[PDB]
Each structure stands twice: as C-alpha cells, then as structure tokens.
Design a protein around this ligand. Structure first.
Ligand SMILES: Cc1cc2nc3c(=O)[nH]c(=O)nc-3n(C[C@H](O)[C@H](O)[C@H](O)COP(=O)(O)O)c2cc1C
Ligand SMILES: Cc1cc2nc3c(=O)[nH]c(=O)nc-3n(C[C@H](O)[C@H](O)[C@H](O)COP(=O)(O)O)c2cc1C
Ligand SMILES: O=C(O)c1[nH]c(=O)[nH]c(=O)c1CCc1ccc(OC(F)(F)F)cc1
Ligand SMILES: O=C(O)c1[nH]c(=O)[nH]c(=O)c1CCc1ccc(OC(F)(F)F)cc1
Lengths: 313, 313
C-alpha cells in the first residue's frame, strides 16, 4: 500500500503539497515545508520586484474556509530563483516555483532566466494565470485572447515543460474554450485546478463589518466553501485534457477530501486554507487518513482509482 | 415591532420568500407557500411548453448545501399564468412569476402575454437570465451582448417594471460590465443575486460516484457553500445600481444570514436550499431570529441597516 507517484520526470513520496501562497513566502517557510512530510512544495507566486502586498487585515479564516486579498506580497523573483538554484534540497522532495507577473513581458523576462535553472536542478514552473492583467479587464484566465497570448509567449521564451494554475470556471462553454486554449500548447504538461473562488464577501454579524481591508472586503474564497467547485474543475479538465496532468486544489481538509480529488482525476493534491490553519503537521494526518481509506477499499496505489469517479448511467 | 415593508408598489409583511425553483412548481406548492409566513412567493421558472426536466436523481443535499441539475421541469407558462390570473390570493402576499424561455423569441412571447395580467393583477416578472447549455456559447448573463439583446427585446415587448435573476460573477470587471448593461434598462427595477453557483461536482467517498445523474454529476450549488459569493454579488450590484433594488438569494439558513444579506444591500431575501430541507416552517424561525438580532442591536427598521455593511478604512 503506497502513496508514491512518478510524474513530470520526478518522484514524489505522496501526492500532497502546499497550495501556492501558503507557508511558502520566506526561506523559513520553504525550509518548513521541506521538513514536513509533504510530497512536494510550491513557492509563493512571485513578481520581478519584491512586493509588500495589500494592507492588513488581508486574510481571515472561519469554520468553513478563508477569504484573502493578499495582493501578491513576495520577496521577488531573484529570491525564489536563488532558493531554487542554491538553497533547496532536491533530495528531500521536488520544488515547484510559481510565477505571477503583472504583464506578459514581466512573465517572459522571469521564465527566460528560470529556464537554465529548471534544466539544471529540475525546478518545475507553475504559471499563475488566475491573476491581474490590465485593470478593468478580467483576470488573465477569464480573457481567452490574453490567455493565448501569455501561453504563446511563455512557451517561446521558456521552451520547457511547465504548468498553469487556473481559476475556477462555472459555465460548460468556458470549460470547453479554456481546455481548447490549453490544448494548443504542448509544453503545458500540468493544469492546477483551482485558484480561489473570486471576489467573495465575508461579513461579521456582530460588528456589521467586512473582515478584510483591501477591495471593500472582497476577496478570494478558499476551504470548505469551494470543494465541489474545485472537484468539478479538476474533473472537467481531466476529461478535456487527456495529454496533460491535473493537480487538484481546493477544500482539502482530510484524506477523504484528497481521495475525492484523486477520483476526480487529480495527480497532485494541494492544501491551502487547511494548511494555513492546522500547520504542516496536517500532512501526516492526510497521509494516514488517505491510506486508511485505501486499506478499507482494497486499493494499493493511487493509479487504481485516479479519475475513476463513477457517473450514474 | 414588525418587519413590514413596501417595494415595487406592493406591501410585504416581511422580506422573506422562496427562491424560484423551491416549493413552487405545482398548485399545491404555491398554495403551501401562500399559507406560509413568507412575505411573498415566486413561481418556478417556466417555458412556453411543460417540461419533465432531467432524469433523477437530480437534486441532493448535504450538511453544507445542495447540488441540482433539475432541467427546468415545470408545468408550462399557461399554468403559471392561470395561477397568477385566477388562483393566487393577492390579499395574502405578492406574487412573482419567473420566466426562463429557451430563446429570446420564447421570452418575448411569454412577456407579451404576461403584461395585461401584471397590469390587472400586480404579478411581478423575474426574468431568469440562466439557460440550458448550447455548446459554443456561454449562458446568457455570461455573454453581455446577448444579455443586452434579451433585455432590449423584453423591455420593448413587456413595457412594465420587471426584475432579473443573475448568476454569480467572480471578477470585478464583470460586475462593472454587467451592472452597466443592466443600468441601460430603466424597466429593470430589481436584480436578484444569486442563482446557483454553476457546475460544481459532488462525489460520495463510499460509493466513489457522483450524486446526481444529469451532466455527469455536474450541477448548480446552493446553501452554505455559496453565502460569501451571494453577499459579494448583492453588495456589488447594490453599489453599482443605485436606482434598482437588489434581492438577495444564497446561503440563508438563519436570521443571522438574512441579516448579512440586508446589510449587504438586500431588499427581499430568498431561501432555496434551507427551505427545501426544512420546509415552510423555516419562515417563522427566520422572522423570529432576524427580529431578535434587530432587538439586541436596537434596530427598529430594515432601512436602518440595509446596505450599511462597514468597510475597514
Ligand atoms: C493567503 C493565501 C495566499 C494565496 N496566494 C496564492 C498565490 O500567491 N498564488 C496562487 O496561485 N494561489 C494562491 N492562493 C490560492 C491557493 O493556492 C489555493 O488556490 C486556494 O486557497 C484554494 O485552496 P484551499 O481551498 O486549500 O484554500 C492563496 C490562497 C491563500 C488563502
Ligand atoms: C431544486 C432547485 C431548483 C431551482 N430552480 C430554479 C429556477 O427554476 N429558477 C431560478 O431562477 N433559480 C432556481 N434555483 C436557484 C435558487 O433559486 C437559488 O438561486 C439557489 O438555490 C441559491 O440559493 P440557496 O443558497 O438558498 O439555495 C433552484 C435551486 C434548486 C436547489
Ligand atoms: O496574492 C494573492 O492575493 C493571491 N491570492 C490568491 O488567492 N490567489 C492568487 O493567485 C494570488 C495572487 C494573484 C493575485 C490575485 C488577486 C489580486 O488582487 C488583489 F486584490 F488580491 F490584490 C492580486 C494578485
Ligand atoms: O431548473 C434548473 O435546473 C435550474 N436550477 C438552478 O439552480 N437554477 C436555474 O435557474 C434553473 C433553471 C434554468 C436552468 C439552468 C441550467 C440548466 O442546465 C441543466 F443542466 F440543469 F439542464 C437548465 C435550466
């Protein structure tokens, strides 16, 4: 009975990893995630220049999940590139490095410089498409002409397998078009579904107030609120992108939640909100809980049930 | 103290009502909602001809919410028209009639016929800008040029105040564009936010199967999953549409949740999943809990706090 996976030319002890943005902004964080029993880790989405991000409070969590408008606080690309090329212990577990440039040119400049490090050390790129373009236009993955442009230019500039982090879609027509854009880029080898459910609004009844400061309290939703949304997107892309891997992310608190992602078609399973809340010890629990479910069901590996969600008739 | 209010030239005993689709498909349902403590009721969204809807199971509910792909099962427009014109006891509470034709022309023909019943009887039109999936094109409220066409044609054909039921949006630029469309139309006097969060997917771990049969298990989400999404849409439209009313719908299971909708800007508050699960008694509880919250805060009227959610700085 084992949780091991071999994909993208790397070996993973188990499918669990942090979600970009959680426990991965500083050297301390990355060392902590590397010391954990996670199967991999991903760095905070970075920009060319370091950013302080939005004013606080900018993250809050509640029994059913979390709202955040962090605003891409990060130490800058040069720090994450240096962690990848000089500080990370690849003998421990593999590393993904997330990039979230604020223009297509910014992203190009960062991937050109990541490419030699990726080829030499085996760092894996996750391009964050669930991200600001021109303000008053939708985020990049909700503008399919912008998305095509970003994938065209990053494909050219990077030249190596990479993956994309995608926002949730809610319309079948959007699933169709999005997968068809992604399917034009043979270097996109993995798709991470999903980023936060955008622009939710949490109000505290006692104080009659929003709970985060940026954007009049509007921010992205994570946690229990979003598990069915995240399962739908994992499965919609698993079905439409047969030549690609799908990583699942959204609402994972337990081995049972991970198991459902995996049934939906997930390879890797990321943990955001619950990890932010419980801390890195969560990975032992999730591993134990998932193995307990496999044992009861007689499953010995993950490939025996990945993507095998049953439909009715 | 009482929660009485006046909107759209009608009086309401309180701001609660069913969400379209729940407890409102047959004469029996509508009679049951009429006998309840709700302040108003809305009929099931209807098409020109009767529809059996999708194969069962097509609705399922869980501790955190519901998923549905009903398929617009309804008795047809002639039935809801007759109910509006000859059966509803307007002395008890106002009636809204939801229309969801499968094309613009279908909707224009229904509204032409509904207009003299509205004039004579005071039934209010809720036009449902969600539709069944036509491969290649998004749902109507997700295609803003289609949406403007629907509204132009309906406004022309109906000629009287009406409201629109909106899917949720998740991006600020979409809120801007959607609200700008809706503000082109002076006859749109109310906006209902929100319809179910589209195409989520619930999987049962024990059976390793989806839980509803249509669309490979994909369906709209309601209930606790969607409250912060519903609050964000209510507030976004409340802010952008100062000459319109906003009706809130999504995640209401208590007087507290209702209270947050009204803080967000809601004039009426619709209950879908919680009403499906608990039955029409829910309306007396919601009344009692909302007044209790009011009492303890010293609010005597809904107007005192509607739309007064506080932001931080
Ligand atoms: C505080 C916070 C920061 C995040 N930052 C990023 C980021 O920098 N890049 C990114 O792709 N996603 C980011 N996310 C999104 C998470 O990676 C994840 O997609 C989302 O929270 C859903 O997973 P969950 O339900 O486990 O939280 C962030 C989420 C949170 C709560
Ligand atoms: C079984 C079922 C049928 C529904 N039918 C309709 C409908 O005919 N028209 C409509 O506008 N919305 C319909 N909805 C959406 C609800 O009106 C409401 O927008 C949604 O359930 C979210 O509110 P909730 O969180 O209270 O459930 C339906 C929902 C359910 C669960
Ligand atoms: O840094 C974040 O805010 C963040 N949070 C997430 O949940 N997902 C992400 O992808 C990111 C980085 C991308 C991004 C999303 C929303 C933004 O608008 C905001 F108002 F939060 F600043 C900015 C960056
Ligand atoms: O009757 C419905 O299924 C339904 N359920 C909702 O949650 N909201 C609605 O507005 C409706 C009626 C409109 C409608 C939406 C999506 C549909 O696709 C489907 F998959 F269910 F066949 C059909 C009707």
């Amino acid at each position: 009975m084992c949780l091991k996976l071999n994909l993208l030319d790397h070996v993973f002890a188990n499918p669990f990893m942090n979600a970009a943005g959680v426990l991965c902004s500083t050297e301390e964080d990355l060392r902590c995630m590397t010391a954990s029993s996670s199967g991999a880790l991903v760095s905070k989405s970075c920009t060319s220049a370091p950013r302080d991000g939005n004013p606080e409070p900018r993250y809050m969590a509640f029994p059913l999940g979390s709202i955040n408008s962090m605003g891409l606080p990060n130490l800058g690309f040069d720090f994450y590139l240096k962690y990848a090329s000089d500080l990370h212990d690849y003998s421990k577990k593999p590393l993904f490095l997330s990039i979230s440039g604020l223009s297509v040119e910014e992203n190009v400049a960062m991937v050109r410089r990541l490419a030699p490090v990726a080829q030499e050390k085996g760092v894996l790129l996750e391009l964050n498409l669930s991200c600001p373009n021109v303000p008053g236009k939708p985020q990049v993955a909700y503008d399919f002409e912008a998305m095509r442009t970003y994938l065209q230019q990053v494909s050219l500039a990077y030249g190596l397998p990479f993956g994309v982090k995608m926002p949730p879609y809610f319309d079948i027509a959007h699933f169709d078009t999005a997968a068809a854009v992604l399917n034009e880029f043979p270097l996109v080898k993995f798709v991470t579904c999903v980023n936060s459910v955008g622009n939710g609004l949490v109000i505290d009844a006692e104080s009659e107030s929003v709970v985060i400061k940026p954007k009049q309290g509007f921010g992205g939703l994570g946690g229990k609120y979003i598990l069915p949304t995240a399962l739908a997107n994992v499965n919609a892309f698993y079905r439409r992108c047969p030549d690609k891997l799908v990583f699942g992310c959204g609402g994972v608190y337990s081995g049972e939640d991970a198991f459902l992602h995996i049934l939906a078609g997930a390879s890797m399973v990321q943990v955001g909100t619950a990890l932010q809340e419980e801390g890195p010890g969560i990975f032992t629990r999730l591993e134990d809980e998932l193995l307990e479910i496999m044992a009861r069901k007689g499953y010995r590996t993950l490939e025996e049930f990945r993507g095998r969600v049953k439909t009715i008739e």
